[PDB]
Amino acid sequence: RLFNAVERDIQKSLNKLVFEPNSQPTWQRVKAAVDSYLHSLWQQGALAGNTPADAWFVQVGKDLTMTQEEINQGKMIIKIGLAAVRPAEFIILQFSQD
Amino acid sequence: PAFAVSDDFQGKYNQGKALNMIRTFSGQGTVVWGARTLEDSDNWRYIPVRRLFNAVERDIQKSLNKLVFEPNSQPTWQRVKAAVDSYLHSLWQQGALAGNT
Amino acid sequence: IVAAGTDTTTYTAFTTVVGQGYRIFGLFDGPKEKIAGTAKPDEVMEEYPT
Amino acid sequence: WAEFTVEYPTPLEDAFYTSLSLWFMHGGGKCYLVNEANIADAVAQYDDITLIVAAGTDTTTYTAFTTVVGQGYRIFGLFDGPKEKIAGTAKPDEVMEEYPTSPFGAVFYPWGTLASGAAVPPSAIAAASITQTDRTRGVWKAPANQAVNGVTPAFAVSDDFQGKYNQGKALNMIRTFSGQGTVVWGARTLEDSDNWRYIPVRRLFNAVERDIQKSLNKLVFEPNSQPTWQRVKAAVDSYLHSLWQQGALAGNTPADAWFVQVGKDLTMTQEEINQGKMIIKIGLAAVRPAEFIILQFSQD
Amino acid sequence: LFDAAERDIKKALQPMVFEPNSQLTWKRVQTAIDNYLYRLWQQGALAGNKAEEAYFVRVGKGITMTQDEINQGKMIIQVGMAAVRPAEFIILKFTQD
Amino acid sequence: VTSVPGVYIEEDASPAMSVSASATAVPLFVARFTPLKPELAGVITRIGSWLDYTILFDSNVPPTASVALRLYFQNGGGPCYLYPLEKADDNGPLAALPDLIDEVGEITLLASPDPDETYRTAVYGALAASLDQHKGYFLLADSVNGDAPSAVGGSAQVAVYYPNVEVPHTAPLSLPPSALIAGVYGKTDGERGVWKAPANVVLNGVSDVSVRVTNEQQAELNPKGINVIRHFSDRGLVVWGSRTQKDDDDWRYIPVRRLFDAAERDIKKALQPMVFEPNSQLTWKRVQTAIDNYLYRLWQQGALAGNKAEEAYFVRVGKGITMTQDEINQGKMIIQVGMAAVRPAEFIILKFTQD
Amino acid sequence: VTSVPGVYIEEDASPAMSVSASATAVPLFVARFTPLKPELAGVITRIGSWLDYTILFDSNVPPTASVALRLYFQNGGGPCYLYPLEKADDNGPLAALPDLIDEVGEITLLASPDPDETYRTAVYGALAASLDQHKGYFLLADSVNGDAPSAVGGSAQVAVYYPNVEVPHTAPLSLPPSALIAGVYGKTDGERGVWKAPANVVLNGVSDVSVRVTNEQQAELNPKGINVIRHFSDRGLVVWGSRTQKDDDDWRYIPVRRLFDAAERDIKKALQPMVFEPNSQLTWKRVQTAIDNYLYRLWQQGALAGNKAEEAYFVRVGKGITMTQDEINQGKMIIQVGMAAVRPAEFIILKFTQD
């Protein structure tokens, strides 16, 4: 349900950004708008990790993704990836003497 | 599935031709099992390696219909050669066809 | 080209459009019920176009 | 197949209806249909005939076949076998004198039965194996191991009944194996001479000249001089070199594979130049099927 | 975009249509076209990166021309842009890592 | 071939092939049984385990065929076939036996667990002709007394195991050991492979031999090569000796015979798809390579007794070598291939010295 | 695939996997019982404790199956199975036994608490074939007298405990110790793990052994490896010796056999979800890592006898190494993996010196 609800708000919002020019000021604006939502979600304890460059990543460009020929077909492809939290279903504890 | 087949009745129908039974396991259920075509030759088995060659040419043949009757010269030869491999390079990073370099 | 319970006249029309080279991939049905498994591994397999 | 159905709306049982339905179902193309009294006219007109098959006719067909061979039309027929069930007790030869001995044709015995409908004469089964062969890989390869579909043979012949009918003449049985099924088996013509056996080596020479004879019709009445001789010699070997890389005729150092020569005193001396004649000769060595594969073990 | 960029430069070259074909005319035309695409580049309409590669307007005599079409009085303006495409079919492709 | 301009599609077809190995196991048995259905009277039937044998057939009460067959599964697994026949001199189905074995492509071993001599020697002469056209059989046999049987006199493919083995049943009944010795060939090819002689393998579940053999008449029976079931104190019963019948230095050993018998059957099964292709030069280098990559994989797993050089194979298929022009016209190919197998190590000699 | 402009949603699917360990315990027993309901006649039944055994089954009065099973729970816990059958020679359900064990994925040990010899040796030969296709079984056995039983002659997975143990009941009745020795494998894997040989563990609740063994015939019985129940004065009865049957230096010890038997069953269960994936290079590095992170966790808890270097595993899955091109076409993968297990320390030798 974390991955199920982290995309139904991005897909709802980007409907007013289609047919926009696929240029350089667009790529630095979606990249700066998505991670400002994930940073609000990292402090709330939803997805775990220190150094919050390690918790998620967002990338959008010209040659890391979506090379020149599929730009001419209009496509604007991105990819983001993030590591969520998982329940502590099993709790084992070890005694020793030291 | 209406029947419970075996573990070994798959075995004697795996050579020659390609019965490709539908068998239910524990956990995952009623799954398909075995992807083999009718011949056993080392070029044409393995149904996904047939559909890969079957769908890698129906998009080139669909596109080159607007390039016939074009002059058979030097700037044509360096343009089709530079347009096909830019489609295969998009298909190599996706893990469709295997090989380094 | 799938077969929804037709075998006899379907196998001829399948190999027809292969003969002109239309680059298609059909898929067929099996035998009806209960290969006994006592014997005969091959005689259930000649009615299918190789 | 489109106009064949609107002409013949009902499915019939006759030998010709079961033959064309087996031709088109394995691909096929532009095919004719003539009565058995007008082969000698239809071949001399339409200028593209290659095969004369027999859809269940023997008596009056063998005369019209050897007629158009007598004028030298460079054609290759193929015949039917005997009807049913050689008992195999004896008599290997008396079933084979009713067939005209010539380097054109085969017989294709076992009479496949077409388990959907009625019987099929085996000339249609042999003609379907050539169609998916030349479209796939050349004409120099024999219609030999490419499988047909939807046809089962009525009999199960043997492993050794092939053996006593492999010499002298060329029964060329149709035998079903495990795995690959109902395949044809054996590509042999009627004589046993070391120049003319092996049906694909006949059709190679049969089709390597019907394109040269078709092209040189616009070069007759040309001046028989020196710039002509160096132009035909440079145009023929550029066609053979395209045919040597494709694996049709075998040999390294492709001066060894063929030869072309045309001149003034090696051929066609001065007096027969004054009569107008322009004679050439070319010779080439084709490939032959590996019908027998023997293998030897040792210890070294 | 190409339909409007042509109509503005074609309307202003019409006052200079019978001037001599010397070298000082060439550098004055090549500059007034250079200062038109640069203003249009820096307002987000030519899809080029932070380099200059959005225009290659050249009007020389060694390049883009030669001597014998000067005698049948001509000029050749090789110019070219790199326009921007609209962004449709936005694809997300979430991953686990 | 091309008239309308259009765009045409075309692929390269070739029968390019490789060779993969099957198993050397799963025999058939020609003893007498009691089938339950009339269609199981005279046809070869595949049996997968001991479970499905109890469904198709039965266990009767007086009767050694049901006892001798369950000892096959306790030693080594694998499926097996069986051919039930009732009368020893019924030469109808006995003549109709060898033309049923050929249609199933797998059959490797041959055996008969029936006790008496009049039934076994009627069988061994019925299919003795089907051993010398090199299709790949290897039968087993037992000896009624101290010398070999004469139904198959001298051949490269037999093996004789002399002393018969008994088994307790409700007085213990004797049993000719040709049944349970087929199962011990199914373990050696599992972990060790074909090229290991089965001797140190231990018989799994028996009381004792019928007659106790000692070392002083082992010396006589180990020539005129027949094998022997031995008894030891610490480890119990064990098979011993791995020598075949005829005793020239060509093939005196079971694995050297069975290594060439299995290497031929895998390459002959895969050359059958390419049997009518043209005899040009590009076919020759494609066959010579697919045979080269089969012996090299088998060399580097310790089965060809060659040193760290390449000298274990010399497969050549050329036209100047190994052929000439005039047998191309009567279409032929010649595959000169040869291996260097490994011999079992018996008679270990120490020869201590002072220096 | 994309026609309407819109916005499309898409995720990356991958079968990326890891391996987690199960337990090596909970056998089934094939002794005779008295079920209460007719559907409990011939089917495997899970028993959780001693409480639910008293609900489904009963305790009768003449009868050793109810006594031998409650001693299992007093030693070590864990659930267990049981398969009731009534007649020793009823080879119907005995043939129908091994095709019921495979459908339950867990079964590790095998035992039979029935007293007499005619019932046990009929069982031990019935499922002796199901030990050599490497699915992961390990049975236990008892000896009728001073030498090993011959129903399973030589195998890597047996264990024999010689002297039978008695127990007081209202004259004390004897009991073959294969029942209560299964429960002592359930304590050693609890705290110490699999890789510790159970010897110093103390039998929990018994009077005395049937025959008193001494050290001078311990010397004879510790070779031809069979184990022994000993009696000591200060600590009472104790099990002794942890050697398996066949005595090459490959596997002579119970834990070295049972360590490789449990490491295979956990990685084979998790590779089963990825069994039809393409054979490219990114699949190879994802499998080689998930095996690497399984032996490293098992190394740093003291079960692989390697030093402070890495040398305990060399798992490699490449294409240049360990494979080549022509077995890709007959789709295969090869996982060369290898460990270095730890041996138990017996025969401690002091050898004092002066300097």
Tab-separated table of N, CA and C in Angstrom, chain F residues 216-322:
chain	number	residue	atom	x	y	z
F	216	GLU	N	42.035	-69.473	-4.501
F	216	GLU	CA	42.853	-70.400	-5.277
F	216	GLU	C	42.169	-70.892	-6.549
F	217	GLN	N	40.842	-70.826	-6.626
F	217	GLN	CA	40.132	-71.020	-7.884
F	217	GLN	C	39.611	-69.718	-8.474
F	218	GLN	N	39.810	-68.590	-7.789
F	218	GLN	CA	39.729	-67.295	-8.457
F	218	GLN	C	40.817	-67.149	-9.515
F	219	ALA	N	41.987	-67.747	-9.280
F	219	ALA	CA	43.085	-67.664	-10.239
F	219	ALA	C	42.739	-68.332	-11.565
F	220	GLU	N	41.891	-69.361	-11.536
F	220	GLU	CA	41.545	-70.085	-12.756
F	220	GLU	C	40.414	-69.399	-13.516
F	221	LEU	N	39.450	-68.827	-12.800
F	221	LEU	CA	38.243	-68.266	-13.400
F	221	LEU	C	38.403	-66.822	-13.858
F	222	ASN	N	39.501	-66.156	-13.507
F	222	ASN	CA	39.682	-64.759	-13.885
F	222	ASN	C	40.267	-64.637	-15.292
F	223	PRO	N	41.101	-65.587	-15.748
F	223	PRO	CA	41.192	-65.834	-17.194
F	223	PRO	C	39.954	-66.543	-17.722
F	224	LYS	N	39.939	-66.850	-19.020
F	224	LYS	CA	38.727	-67.185	-19.776
F	224	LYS	C	37.557	-66.297	-19.346
F	225	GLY	N	37.786	-64.990	-19.469
F	225	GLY	CA	37.230	-63.991	-18.574
F	225	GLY	C	35.749	-64.073	-18.267
F	226	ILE	N	35.449	-64.477	-17.036
F	226	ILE	CA	34.115	-64.432	-16.456
F	226	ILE	C	34.255	-63.802	-15.078
F	227	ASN	N	33.217	-63.095	-14.642
F	227	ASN	CA	33.339	-62.355	-13.396
F	227	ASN	C	32.860	-63.222	-12.234
F	228	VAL	N	32.782	-62.634	-11.044
F	228	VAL	CA	32.582	-63.409	-9.824
F	228	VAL	C	31.966	-62.504	-8.766
F	229	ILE	N	31.019	-63.052	-8.015
F	229	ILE	CA	30.517	-62.409	-6.805
F	229	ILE	C	31.317	-62.964	-5.634
F	230	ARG	N	31.968	-62.082	-4.884
F	230	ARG	CA	32.797	-62.494	-3.761
F	230	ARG	C	32.105	-62.194	-2.439
F	231	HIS	N	32.600	-62.837	-1.385
F	231	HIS	CA	32.192	-62.551	-0.016
F	231	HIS	C	33.403	-62.113	0.795
F	232	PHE	N	33.267	-60.999	1.507
F	232	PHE	CA	34.277	-60.542	2.445
F	232	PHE	C	33.676	-60.451	3.841
F	233	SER	N	34.555	-60.447	4.844
F	233	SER	CA	34.092	-60.475	6.227
F	233	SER	C	33.637	-59.099	6.697
F	234	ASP	N	34.419	-58.060	6.394
F	234	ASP	CA	34.151	-56.737	6.949
F	234	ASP	C	33.036	-56.011	6.204
F	235	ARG	N	32.975	-56.153	4.880
F	235	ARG	CA	32.039	-55.384	4.072
F	235	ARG	C	30.960	-56.231	3.406
F	236	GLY	N	30.933	-57.539	3.647
F	236	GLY	CA	29.868	-58.356	3.098
F	236	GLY	C	30.118	-58.743	1.649
F	237	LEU	N	29.024	-58.980	0.930
F	237	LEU	CA	29.117	-59.382	-0.465
F	237	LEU	C	29.510	-58.196	-1.339
F	238	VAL	N	30.246	-58.486	-2.408
F	238	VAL	CA	30.671	-57.459	-3.354
F	238	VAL	C	30.905	-58.113	-4.709
F	239	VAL	N	30.582	-57.380	-5.777
F	239	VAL	CA	30.944	-57.829	-7.115
F	239	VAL	C	32.441	-57.619	-7.336
F	240	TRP	N	33.001	-58.391	-8.266
F	240	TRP	CA	34.448	-58.444	-8.418
F	240	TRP	C	34.800	-58.836	-9.844
F	241	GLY	N	35.748	-58.111	-10.433
F	241	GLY	CA	36.158	-58.336	-11.805
F	241	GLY	C	35.277	-57.637	-12.819
F	242	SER	N	35.886	-57.058	-13.851
F	242	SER	CA	35.163	-56.263	-14.841
F	242	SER	C	35.693	-56.563	-16.241
F	243	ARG	N	35.847	-57.846	-16.557
F	243	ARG	CA	36.415	-58.281	-17.824
F	243	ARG	C	35.329	-58.871	-18.715
F	244	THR	N	35.433	-58.614	-20.017
F	244	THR	CA	34.490	-59.150	-20.985
F	244	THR	C	34.991	-60.508	-21.480
F	245	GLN	N	34.400	-61.010	-22.565
F	245	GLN	CA	34.581	-62.417	-22.924
F	245	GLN	C	35.883	-62.627	-23.694
F	246	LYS	N	35.973	-62.058	-24.893
F	246	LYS	CA	37.069	-62.359	-25.802
F	246	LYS	C	38.276	-61.481	-25.493
F	247	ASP	N	39.455	-62.104	-25.492
F	247	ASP	CA	40.582	-61.585	-24.727
F	247	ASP	C	41.753	-61.169	-25.608
F	248	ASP	N	41.497	-60.447	-26.696
F	248	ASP	CA	42.561	-59.656	-27.292
F	248	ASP	C	42.630	-58.271	-26.654
F	249	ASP	N	43.765	-57.603	-26.858
F	249	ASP	CA	44.015	-56.310	-26.233
F	249	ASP	C	43.188	-55.185	-26.844
F	250	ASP	N	42.308	-55.490	-27.797
F	250	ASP	CA	41.386	-54.503	-28.344
F	250	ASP	C	40.366	-54.045	-27.305
F	251	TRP	N	39.490	-54.946	-26.848
F	251	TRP	CA	38.559	-54.632	-25.760
F	251	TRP	C	38.476	-55.829	-24.816
F	252	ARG	N	39.213	-55.759	-23.708
F	252	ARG	CA	39.108	-56.733	-22.627
F	252	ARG	C	38.338	-56.211	-21.422
F	253	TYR	N	37.928	-54.945	-21.428
F	253	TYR	CA	37.371	-54.302	-20.247
F	253	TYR	C	35.968	-53.782	-20.529
F	254	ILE	N	35.103	-53.899	-19.519
F	254	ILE	CA	33.717	-53.439	-19.659
F	254	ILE	C	33.619	-51.958	-20.010
F	255	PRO	N	34.314	-51.036	-19.327
F	255	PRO	CA	34.101	-49.613	-19.637
F	255	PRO	C	34.666	-49.189	-20.979
F	256	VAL	N	35.774	-49.785	-21.426
F	256	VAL	CA	36.318	-49.414	-22.727
F	256	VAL	C	35.384	-49.870	-23.841
F	257	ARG	N	34.679	-50.982	-23.632
F	257	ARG	CA	33.631	-51.389	-24.562
F	257	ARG	C	32.425	-50.460	-24.487
F	258	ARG	N	31.993	-50.109	-23.275
F	258	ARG	CA	30.801	-49.291	-23.103
F	258	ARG	C	31.051	-47.801	-23.294
F	259	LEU	N	32.307	-47.361	-23.379
F	259	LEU	CA	32.553	-45.959	-23.696
F	259	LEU	C	32.394	-45.693	-25.188
F	260	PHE	N	32.895	-46.596	-26.034
F	260	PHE	CA	32.712	-46.445	-27.472
F	260	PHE	C	31.277	-46.726	-27.897
F	261	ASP	N	30.534	-47.504	-27.108
F	261	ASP	CA	29.148	-47.820	-27.432
F	261	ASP	C	28.207	-46.652	-27.167
F	262	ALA	N	28.550	-45.781	-26.219
F	262	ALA	CA	27.726	-44.622	-25.903
F	262	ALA	C	28.133	-43.371	-26.666
F	263	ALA	N	29.413	-43.244	-27.026
F	263	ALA	CA	29.840	-42.090	-27.809
F	263	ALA	C	29.336	-42.153	-29.245
F	264	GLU	N	29.113	-43.357	-29.779
F	264	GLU	CA	28.579	-43.462	-31.134
F	264	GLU	C	27.087	-43.148	-31.179
F	265	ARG	N	26.336	-43.561	-30.155
F	265	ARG	CA	24.881	-43.468	-30.206
F	265	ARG	C	24.385	-42.034	-30.062
F	266	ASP	N	25.189	-41.147	-29.473
F	266	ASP	CA	24.793	-39.751	-29.339
F	266	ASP	C	25.096	-38.927	-30.585
F	267	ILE	N	26.184	-39.231	-31.294
F	267	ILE	CA	26.462	-38.496	-32.523
F	267	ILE	C	25.676	-39.059	-33.702
F	268	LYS	N	25.307	-40.340	-33.659
F	268	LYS	CA	24.522	-40.912	-34.747
F	268	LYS	C	23.069	-40.459	-34.696
F	269	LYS	N	22.571	-40.107	-33.508
F	269	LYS	CA	21.193	-39.649	-33.380
F	269	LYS	C	21.013	-38.214	-33.858
F	270	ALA	N	22.074	-37.405	-33.831
F	270	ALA	CA	21.973	-36.002	-34.203
F	270	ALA	C	22.460	-35.706	-35.615
F	271	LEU	N	23.178	-36.632	-36.252
F	271	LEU	CA	23.477	-36.495	-37.673
F	271	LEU	C	22.316	-36.915	-38.562
F	272	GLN	N	21.297	-37.552	-37.997
F	272	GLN	CA	20.111	-38.012	-38.710
F	272	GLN	C	19.235	-36.872	-39.231
F	273	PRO	N	19.156	-35.722	-38.550
F	273	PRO	CA	18.528	-34.560	-39.198
F	273	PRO	C	19.276	-34.022	-40.406
F	274	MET	N	20.597	-34.152	-40.473
F	274	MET	CA	21.336	-33.746	-41.671
F	274	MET	C	21.871	-34.982	-42.395
F	275	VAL	N	21.058	-35.524	-43.302
F	275	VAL	CA	21.386	-36.759	-44.001
F	275	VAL	C	21.198	-36.634	-45.505
F	276	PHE	N	20.707	-35.491	-45.989
F	276	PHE	CA	20.509	-35.254	-47.413
F	276	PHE	C	21.018	-33.878	-47.836
F	277	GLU	N	21.856	-33.249	-47.019
F	277	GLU	CA	22.411	-31.946	-47.339
F	277	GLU	C	23.553	-32.056	-48.346
F	278	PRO	N	23.818	-30.983	-49.092
F	278	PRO	CA	24.877	-31.027	-50.105
F	278	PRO	C	26.254	-31.210	-49.485
F	279	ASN	N	27.156	-31.780	-50.282
F	279	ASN	CA	28.459	-32.255	-49.820
F	279	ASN	C	29.551	-31.220	-50.063
F	280	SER	N	29.228	-29.941	-49.888
F	280	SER	CA	30.167	-28.859	-50.154
F	280	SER	C	31.150	-28.735	-48.990
F	281	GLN	N	31.902	-27.635	-48.957
F	281	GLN	CA	32.941	-27.463	-47.948
F	281	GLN	C	32.436	-26.815	-46.666
F	282	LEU	N	31.408	-25.965	-46.736
F	282	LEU	CA	30.931	-25.322	-45.516
F	282	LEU	C	30.143	-26.279	-44.631
F	283	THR	N	29.648	-27.387	-45.188
F	283	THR	CA	29.032	-28.420	-44.365
F	283	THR	C	30.089	-29.219	-43.609
F	284	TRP	N	31.270	-29.376	-44.208
F	284	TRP	CA	32.331	-30.178	-43.607
F	284	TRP	C	32.884	-29.532	-42.343
F	285	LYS	N	33.126	-28.220	-42.373
F	285	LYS	CA	33.657	-27.544	-41.194
F	285	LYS	C	32.612	-27.367	-40.099
F	286	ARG	N	31.323	-27.454	-40.427
F	286	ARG	CA	30.303	-27.345	-39.390
F	286	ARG	C	30.090	-28.670	-38.669
F	287	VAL	N	30.313	-29.791	-39.355
F	287	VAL	CA	30.221	-31.099	-38.716
F	287	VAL	C	31.480	-31.395	-37.910
F	288	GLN	N	32.650	-31.089	-38.478
F	288	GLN	CA	33.915	-31.348	-37.798
F	288	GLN	C	34.050	-30.533	-36.516
F	289	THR	N	33.370	-29.388	-36.429
F	289	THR	CA	33.425	-28.602	-35.201
F	289	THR	C	32.490	-29.159	-34.133
F	290	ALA	N	31.276	-29.564	-34.518
F	290	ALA	CA	30.328	-30.069	-33.533
F	290	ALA	C	30.741	-31.423	-32.970
F	291	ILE	N	31.625	-32.144	-33.662
F	291	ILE	CA	32.241	-33.333	-33.082
F	291	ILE	C	33.446	-32.954	-32.225
F	292	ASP	N	34.149	-31.880	-32.590
F	292	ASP	CA	35.301	-31.434	-31.814
F	292	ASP	C	34.890	-30.925	-30.439
F	293	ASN	N	33.785	-30.188	-30.362
F	293	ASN	CA	33.303	-29.671	-29.087
F	293	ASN	C	32.563	-30.713	-28.258
F	294	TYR	N	32.455	-31.952	-28.734
F	294	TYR	CA	31.877	-33.031	-27.941
F	294	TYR	C	32.927	-33.880	-27.236
F	295	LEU	N	34.051	-34.160	-27.897
F	295	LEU	CA	35.129	-34.906	-27.262
F	295	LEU	C	35.968	-34.040	-26.334
F	296	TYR	N	36.003	-32.725	-26.561
F	296	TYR	CA	36.775	-31.845	-25.690
F	296	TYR	C	36.109	-31.691	-24.329
F	297	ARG	N	34.778	-31.579	-24.306
F	297	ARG	CA	34.054	-31.555	-23.039
F	297	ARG	C	34.191	-32.881	-22.301
F	298	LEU	N	34.211	-33.991	-23.037
F	298	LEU	CA	34.378	-35.303	-22.426
F	298	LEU	C	35.822	-35.581	-22.031
F	299	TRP	N	36.783	-34.877	-22.631
F	299	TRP	CA	38.181	-35.047	-22.248
F	299	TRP	C	38.470	-34.380	-20.908
F	300	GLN	N	37.983	-33.155	-20.719
F	300	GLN	CA	38.288	-32.358	-19.539
F	300	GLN	C	37.433	-32.723	-18.328
F	301	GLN	N	36.725	-33.854	-18.361
F	301	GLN	CA	36.121	-34.423	-17.162
F	301	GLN	C	36.666	-35.814	-16.851
F	302	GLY	N	37.843	-36.144	-17.374
F	302	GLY	CA	38.576	-37.316	-16.936
F	302	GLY	C	38.045	-38.631	-17.467
F	303	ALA	N	37.886	-38.735	-18.786
F	303	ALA	CA	37.434	-39.975	-19.406
F	303	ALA	C	38.264	-40.412	-20.603
F	304	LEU	N	39.058	-39.528	-21.201
F	304	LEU	CA	40.001	-39.881	-22.254
F	304	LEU	C	41.410	-39.834	-21.681
F	305	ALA	N	42.109	-40.970	-21.715
F	305	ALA	CA	43.435	-41.069	-21.105
F	305	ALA	C	44.472	-40.462	-22.051
F	306	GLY	N	44.434	-39.135	-22.139
F	306	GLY	CA	45.487	-38.370	-22.773
F	306	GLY	C	46.176	-37.437	-21.799
F	307	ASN	N	47.398	-37.012	-22.116
F	307	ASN	CA	48.119	-36.119	-21.221
F	307	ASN	C	47.695	-34.680	-21.492
F	308	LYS	N	48.462	-33.708	-20.998
F	308	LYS	CA	48.062	-32.308	-21.094
F	308	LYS	C	48.167	-31.743	-22.505
F	309	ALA	N	48.577	-32.537	-23.490
F	309	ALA	CA	48.459	-32.145	-24.887
F	309	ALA	C	47.025	-32.349	-25.376
F	310	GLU	N	46.823	-32.185	-26.683
F	310	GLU	CA	45.524	-32.344	-27.319
F	310	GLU	C	45.241	-33.775	-27.760
F	311	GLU	N	46.224	-34.672	-27.670
F	311	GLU	CA	46.207	-35.936	-28.410
F	311	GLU	C	45.187	-36.886	-27.784
F	312	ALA	N	43.915	-36.628	-28.094
F	312	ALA	CA	42.843	-37.563	-27.791
F	312	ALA	C	41.823	-37.682	-28.914
F	313	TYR	N	41.980	-36.935	-30.004
F	313	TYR	CA	41.011	-36.913	-31.090
F	313	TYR	C	41.677	-36.324	-32.326
F	314	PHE	N	41.330	-36.862	-33.494
F	314	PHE	CA	41.888	-36.404	-34.764
F	314	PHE	C	40.813	-36.379	-35.842
F	315	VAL	N	39.636	-35.861	-35.494
F	315	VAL	CA	38.477	-35.887	-36.380
F	315	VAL	C	38.759	-35.030	-37.610
F	316	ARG	N	38.657	-35.639	-38.791
F	316	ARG	CA	38.951	-34.956	-40.043
F	316	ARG	C	37.960	-35.412	-41.104
F	317	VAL	N	37.551	-34.477	-41.961
F	317	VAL	CA	36.409	-34.689	-42.842
F	317	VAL	C	36.697	-34.112	-44.226
F	318	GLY	N	37.954	-33.765	-44.487
F	318	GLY	CA	38.296	-33.031	-45.688
F	318	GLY	C	38.086	-33.850	-46.951
F	319	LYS	N	38.481	-33.257	-48.077
F	319	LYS	CA	38.379	-33.926	-49.368
F	319	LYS	C	39.718	-34.434	-49.884
F	320	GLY	N	40.789	-33.657	-49.710
F	320	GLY	CA	42.112	-34.171	-50.022
F	320	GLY	C	42.521	-35.292	-49.086
F	321	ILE	N	42.420	-35.047	-47.785
F	321	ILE	CA	42.500	-36.103	-46.786
F	321	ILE	C	41.189	-36.879	-46.744
F	322	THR	N	41.301	-38.164	-46.398
F	322	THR	CA	40.229	-39.059	-45.956
F	322	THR	C	39.168	-39.332	-47.021
